[PDB]
Amino acid sequence: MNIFEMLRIDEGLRLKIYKDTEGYYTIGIGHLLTKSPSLNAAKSELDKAIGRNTNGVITKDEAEKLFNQDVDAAVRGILRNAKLKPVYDSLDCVRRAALINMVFQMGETGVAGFTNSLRMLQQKRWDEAAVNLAKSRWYNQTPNRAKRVITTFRTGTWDAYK
């Protein structure tokens, strides 16, 4: 198991523009296109992202390409973030994957706001962090996925993904 497989499980793969859990236009492996309500705006952003007239449909290869770029960008945002970096550097590889997943879902900004949980993870107080992470809109809106990531931080293993 690794970050790619983990997120492929959490996000699925769709080759036609779709709406995510928040109702935003997305495609591929959880690649958000736009928060705008306009399908055209979405098709526009899609073509711009792919470099061709897609007509709202992409290939598997294209999806995987966006995906790789998105993972990369998540890691890179973490490393450039003063609040996140130290946490990330303090964690083992499995838990780093949990932090990346959250950043991929919610953006660096979103995650950097879980101050208390972050401090707990930094301190390696796993059970406490898990309880704190659960008191969040994130958990209440996407409880099954949140549970998986939370179990990952709590245990340091991939059991939730097996």
Residue numbers of the site for Cl ion (CB under 5 A)? Answer: 49, 142, 144-145
Based on CB atoms, which residue is closest to Cl ion, 9 or 91? 9
Which distant-in-sequence residues (6+ apart) come within 8 Å of 87 by Cβ? 99, 118, 121, 122
Question: Is 92 a known active-site residue?
Answer: no
Catalytic residue among 10, 11, 62, 108: 11
**What are the C-alpha distances in Å from 135 to residues 38, 104, 117, 146?**
33, 20, 10, 11
**49 vs 118 by CB, closer to Cl ion:** 49
Residue 114 labelled as part of a binding site: no
Residue 84, helix vs strand vs coil:
coil
Nearest to 88 by CA among 42, 135, 121: 121
Identify whether 5 is a catalytic site residue: no
Catalytically annotated residue among 20, 47, 70, 128? 20
Query: Smallest distance, Å, CB 70 to Cl ion?
Result: 8
| 89-98: burial string, b at 16+ Cβ within 10 Å, e else | eebeebbbbb
Least distance in Å: CB of 89 to Cl ion? 27
Is residue 32 classed as helix, strand or coil in its secondary structure?
strand
117 annotated as a binding-site residue: yes
Q: Compute the least distance from the CB of residue 118 to Cl ion, in Å.
A: 22
Taking the least distance from each CB to Cl ion, the nearer of 55 and 115 is: 55
Q: Which residues does the annotation place in the binding site for substrate?
A: 32, 104, 117, 132
Catalytic residues: 11, 20
